[PDB]
Amino acid sequence: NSNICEVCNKWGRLFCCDTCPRSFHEHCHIPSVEANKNPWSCIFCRIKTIQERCPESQSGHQESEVLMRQMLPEEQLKCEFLLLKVYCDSKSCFFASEPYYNREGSQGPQKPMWLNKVKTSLNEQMYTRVEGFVQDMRLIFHNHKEFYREDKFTRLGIQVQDIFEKNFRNIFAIQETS
Ligand SMILES: [Zn+2]
Ligand SMILES: [Zn+2]
Ligand SMILES: [Zn+2]
């Protein structure tokens, strides 16, 4: 196994996947690494199994159909994995914890949102459709862009949204378009 967390790239108290060489901090993996379970397989491996069991699941889909899916166990896992992919980028730090807003010439968003809040919401099974999770994720970056206006810091929201969107299209097998 790797000797650094797959998500944050640091060493520490690491749990190793039995079916692949990746390793994780307890609360870096999503869901948090399970108490017992020998052997244990990471989210990466669980996602690869879904694909392998239903090869046609990789055929293109329309975003509108994906959003309307109910959050059955496979969709729950796909959203957990998508969230984890965002935490894998170091720029996610800006979006992880609860924000506050006090900048001359700007007003804070009406509905603040952050990654740890989406993570708690997934853990608590608060989303009934994929659309609820995707809407909160896109709201994180939209709030950032509107608040930071012409400050160059706005770019961090564009960057981390691009990671989210590329991974959304991959994980949910969105039909490729020009
Ligand atoms: Zn970690
Ligand atoms: Zn694995
Ligand atoms: Zn099949």
mmCIF file of C-alpha atoms and ligand atoms in Angstrom:
data_model
loop_
_atom_site.group_PDB
_atom_site.id
_atom_site.type_symbol
_atom_site.label_atom_id
_atom_site.label_comp_id
_atom_site.label_asym_id
_atom_site.label_seq_id
_atom_site.Cartn_x
_atom_site.Cartn_y
_atom_site.Cartn_z
ATOM 1 C CA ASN A 1 0.000 0.000 0.000
ATOM 2 C CA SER A 2 0.867 3.695 -0.454
ATOM 3 C CA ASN A 3 2.381 5.414 2.610
ATOM 4 C CA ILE A 4 0.408 8.694 2.136
ATOM 5 C CA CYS A 5 -3.389 9.427 2.324
ATOM 6 C CA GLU A 6 -4.867 9.368 -1.189
ATOM 7 C CA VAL A 7 -7.002 12.445 -0.413
ATOM 8 C CA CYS A 8 -4.687 14.913 1.508
ATOM 9 C CA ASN A 9 -1.310 13.413 0.561
ATOM 10 C CA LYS A 10 0.001 13.350 4.161
ATOM 11 C CA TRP A 11 1.225 10.461 6.285
ATOM 12 C CA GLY A 12 -0.263 9.575 9.549
ATOM 13 C CA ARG A 13 -2.727 6.955 10.939
ATOM 14 C CA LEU A 14 -3.573 5.311 7.544
ATOM 15 C CA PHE A 15 -6.067 2.532 6.710
ATOM 16 C CA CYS A 16 -5.096 0.464 3.767
ATOM 17 C CA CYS A 17 -7.400 -0.858 1.066
ATOM 18 C CA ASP A 18 -7.342 -4.677 0.676
ATOM 19 C CA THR A 19 -8.052 -4.636 -3.035
ATOM 20 C CA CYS A 20 -5.937 -1.755 -4.189
ATOM 21 C CA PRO A 21 -2.752 -0.008 -3.020
ATOM 22 C CA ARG A 22 -4.452 3.187 -1.808
ATOM 23 C CA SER A 23 -4.460 4.357 1.778
ATOM 24 C CA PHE A 24 -6.609 6.820 3.810
ATOM 25 C CA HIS A 25 -6.962 8.792 6.886
ATOM 26 C CA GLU A 26 -10.113 7.712 8.737
ATOM 27 C CA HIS A 27 -12.079 10.923 8.000
ATOM 28 C CA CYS A 28 -10.502 11.624 4.640
ATOM 29 C CA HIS A 29 -12.237 8.566 3.151
ATOM 30 C CA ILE A 30 -15.921 9.040 2.469
ATOM 31 C CA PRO A 31 -17.749 7.378 3.997
ATOM 32 C CA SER A 32 -15.349 7.476 7.101
ATOM 33 C CA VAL A 33 -13.307 4.258 7.186
ATOM 34 C CA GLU A 34 -15.533 1.511 8.613
ATOM 35 C CA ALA A 35 -14.773 0.144 12.225
ATOM 36 C CA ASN A 36 -14.318 -3.518 11.392
ATOM 37 C CA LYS A 37 -14.654 -5.165 7.917
ATOM 38 C CA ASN A 38 -11.762 -7.492 7.049
ATOM 39 C CA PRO A 39 -11.125 -7.360 4.194
ATOM 40 C CA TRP A 40 -11.957 -3.640 3.509
ATOM 41 C CA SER A 41 -12.339 -2.127 0.062
ATOM 42 C CA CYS A 42 -12.010 1.692 -0.542
ATOM 43 C CA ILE A 43 -14.606 3.812 -2.391
ATOM 44 C CA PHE A 44 -12.445 3.643 -5.511
ATOM 45 C CA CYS A 45 -12.711 -0.117 -5.521
ATOM 46 C CA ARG A 46 -16.453 -0.069 -4.741
ATOM 47 C CA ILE A 47 -17.088 2.263 -7.648
ATOM 48 C CA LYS A 48 -15.016 0.082 -10.022
ATOM 49 C CA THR A 49 -17.124 -2.942 -8.889
ATOM 50 C CA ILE A 50 -20.423 -1.188 -9.871
ATOM 51 C CA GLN A 51 -18.987 -0.500 -13.277
ATOM 52 C CA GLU A 52 -17.758 -4.116 -13.686
ATOM 53 C CA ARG A 53 -21.087 -5.596 -12.655
ATOM 54 C CA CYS A 54 -22.999 -3.383 -15.136
ATOM 55 C CA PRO A 55 -20.745 -2.494 -18.076
ATOM 56 C CA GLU A 56 -23.584 -0.645 -19.803
ATOM 57 C CA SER A 57 -23.606 1.809 -16.875
ATOM 58 C CA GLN A 58 -20.719 3.531 -18.726
ATOM 59 C CA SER A 59 -22.817 4.397 -21.764
ATOM 60 C CA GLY A 60 -23.647 8.121 -22.061
ATOM 61 C CA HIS A 61 -26.449 9.632 -19.988
ATOM 62 C CA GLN A 62 -28.290 12.917 -20.005
ATOM 63 C CA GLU A 63 -27.574 15.187 -16.991
ATOM 64 C CA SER A 64 -31.295 15.797 -16.542
ATOM 65 C CA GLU A 65 -31.980 12.122 -16.085
ATOM 66 C CA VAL A 66 -29.048 11.663 -13.695
ATOM 67 C CA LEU A 67 -30.209 14.566 -11.491
ATOM 68 C CA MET A 68 -33.661 13.069 -11.079
ATOM 69 C CA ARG A 69 -32.409 9.761 -9.816
ATOM 70 C CA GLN A 70 -33.352 8.850 -6.313
ATOM 71 C CA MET A 71 -30.513 8.390 -3.817
ATOM 72 C CA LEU A 72 -30.526 4.581 -3.690
ATOM 73 C CA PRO A 73 -27.274 2.972 -2.410
ATOM 74 C CA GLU A 74 -25.364 3.139 -5.732
ATOM 75 C CA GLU A 75 -26.219 6.830 -6.289
ATOM 76 C CA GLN A 76 -25.340 7.598 -2.615
ATOM 77 C CA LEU A 77 -21.961 5.998 -3.196
ATOM 78 C CA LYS A 78 -21.387 7.831 -6.487
ATOM 79 C CA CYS A 79 -22.092 11.212 -4.741
ATOM 80 C CA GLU A 80 -19.756 10.262 -1.866
ATOM 81 C CA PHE A 81 -17.046 9.460 -4.380
ATOM 82 C CA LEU A 82 -17.642 12.742 -6.320
ATOM 83 C CA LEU A 83 -17.375 14.674 -3.021
ATOM 84 C CA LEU A 84 -14.157 12.824 -2.206
ATOM 85 C CA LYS A 85 -12.723 13.695 -5.627
ATOM 86 C CA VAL A 86 -13.203 17.393 -4.789
ATOM 87 C CA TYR A 87 -11.430 17.006 -1.404
ATOM 88 C CA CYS A 88 -8.578 15.343 -3.289
ATOM 89 C CA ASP A 89 -7.634 18.748 -4.742
ATOM 90 C CA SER A 90 -5.678 20.879 -2.343
ATOM 91 C CA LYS A 91 -7.693 23.956 -3.359
ATOM 92 C CA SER A 92 -10.710 22.396 -1.619
ATOM 93 C CA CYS A 93 -9.430 23.861 1.579
ATOM 94 C CA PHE A 94 -10.965 27.183 0.731
ATOM 95 C CA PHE A 95 -14.449 25.554 0.491
ATOM 96 C CA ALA A 96 -14.277 23.005 3.310
ATOM 97 C CA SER A 97 -15.321 24.829 6.404
ATOM 98 C CA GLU A 98 -18.023 27.362 7.148
ATOM 99 C CA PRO A 99 -17.332 30.705 5.428
ATOM 100 C CA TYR A 100 -17.926 34.246 6.639
ATOM 101 C CA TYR A 101 -18.464 37.363 4.625
ATOM 102 C CA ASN A 102 -17.154 40.886 5.479
ATOM 103 C CA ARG A 103 -15.740 42.622 2.412
ATOM 104 C CA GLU A 104 -16.300 46.263 1.457
ATOM 105 C CA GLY A 105 -18.639 46.425 -1.529
ATOM 106 C CA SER A 106 -20.005 42.894 -1.255
ATOM 107 C CA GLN A 107 -22.803 41.235 0.608
ATOM 108 C CA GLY A 108 -22.703 37.550 1.718
ATOM 109 C CA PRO A 109 -24.785 34.930 0.001
ATOM 110 C CA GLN A 110 -28.356 34.219 1.039
ATOM 111 C CA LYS A 111 -27.602 30.534 1.420
ATOM 112 C CA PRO A 112 -24.025 29.787 2.492
ATOM 113 C CA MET A 113 -22.692 26.340 1.639
ATOM 114 C CA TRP A 114 -19.462 24.433 2.188
ATOM 115 C CA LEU A 115 -17.991 20.971 1.684
ATOM 116 C CA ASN A 116 -18.170 19.784 5.267
ATOM 117 C CA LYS A 117 -21.860 20.704 5.294
ATOM 118 C CA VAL A 118 -22.430 18.571 2.119
ATOM 119 C CA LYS A 119 -20.465 15.800 3.753
ATOM 120 C CA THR A 120 -22.671 15.844 6.895
ATOM 121 C CA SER A 121 -25.759 15.987 4.676
ATOM 122 C CA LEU A 122 -24.695 12.847 2.791
ATOM 123 C CA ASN A 123 -23.838 11.059 6.034
ATOM 124 C CA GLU A 124 -27.272 11.948 7.466
ATOM 125 C CA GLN A 125 -29.080 10.770 4.244
ATOM 126 C CA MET A 126 -30.603 14.289 3.765
ATOM 127 C CA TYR A 127 -30.605 14.130 -0.029
ATOM 128 C CA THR A 128 -33.483 12.144 -1.678
ATOM 129 C CA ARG A 129 -32.272 12.779 -5.298
ATOM 130 C CA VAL A 130 -28.868 13.339 -6.969
ATOM 131 C CA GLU A 131 -30.114 16.793 -7.850
ATOM 132 C CA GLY A 132 -30.019 17.908 -4.099
ATOM 133 C CA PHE A 133 -26.359 17.017 -3.804
ATOM 134 C CA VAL A 134 -25.377 18.571 -7.132
ATOM 135 C CA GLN A 135 -27.270 21.760 -6.406
ATOM 136 C CA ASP A 136 -25.478 22.263 -3.062
ATOM 137 C CA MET A 137 -22.090 21.527 -4.666
ATOM 138 C CA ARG A 138 -22.650 24.031 -7.487
ATOM 139 C CA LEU A 139 -23.929 26.592 -4.950
ATOM 140 C CA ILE A 140 -20.567 26.549 -3.164
ATOM 141 C CA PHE A 141 -18.821 27.865 -6.292
ATOM 142 C CA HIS A 142 -21.573 30.174 -7.409
ATOM 143 C CA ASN A 143 -21.635 31.914 -3.927
ATOM 144 C CA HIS A 144 -17.845 32.348 -4.187
ATOM 145 C CA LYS A 145 -17.962 33.919 -7.655
ATOM 146 C CA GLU A 146 -20.688 36.339 -6.743
ATOM 147 C CA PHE A 147 -19.094 37.445 -3.434
ATOM 148 C CA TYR A 148 -15.504 37.943 -4.719
ATOM 149 C CA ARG A 149 -16.660 39.938 -7.792
ATOM 150 C CA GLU A 150 -13.589 41.151 -9.670
ATOM 151 C CA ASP A 151 -11.074 40.034 -7.089
ATOM 152 C CA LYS A 152 -8.700 37.525 -8.704
ATOM 153 C CA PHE A 153 -9.581 35.146 -5.824
ATOM 154 C CA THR A 154 -12.752 34.400 -7.796
ATOM 155 C CA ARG A 155 -10.575 32.070 -9.860
ATOM 156 C CA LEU A 156 -10.330 29.545 -7.040
ATOM 157 C CA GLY A 157 -14.093 28.929 -7.400
ATOM 158 C CA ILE A 158 -13.713 28.353 -11.176
ATOM 159 C CA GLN A 159 -10.874 25.974 -10.605
ATOM 160 C CA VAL A 160 -12.507 23.782 -7.995
ATOM 161 C CA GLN A 161 -15.849 23.849 -9.901
ATOM 162 C CA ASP A 162 -13.989 22.532 -12.974
ATOM 163 C CA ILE A 163 -12.719 19.584 -10.853
ATOM 164 C CA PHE A 164 -16.258 18.932 -9.630
ATOM 165 C CA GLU A 165 -17.769 19.065 -13.168
ATOM 166 C CA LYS A 166 -15.128 16.834 -14.837
ATOM 167 C CA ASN A 167 -15.589 14.280 -12.098
ATOM 168 C CA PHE A 168 -19.386 14.523 -12.253
ATOM 169 C CA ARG A 169 -19.281 13.761 -15.981
ATOM 170 C CA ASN A 170 -16.924 10.811 -15.398
ATOM 171 C CA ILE A 171 -18.615 9.226 -12.443
ATOM 172 C CA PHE A 172 -22.163 9.523 -13.773
ATOM 173 C CA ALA A 173 -21.107 8.737 -17.382
ATOM 174 C CA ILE A 174 -22.570 11.883 -18.822
ATOM 175 C CA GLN A 175 -22.751 11.743 -22.656
ATOM 176 C CA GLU A 176 -19.788 13.520 -24.175
ATOM 177 C CA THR A 177 -20.550 16.687 -26.204
ATOM 178 C CA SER A 178 -18.811 19.567 -28.054
HETATM 179 ZN ZN ZN B 1 -5.866 12.362 4.564
HETATM 180 ZN ZN ZN B 2 -9.196 0.302 -3.070
HETATM 181 ZN ZN ZN B 3 -25.349 -6.325 -16.188
#
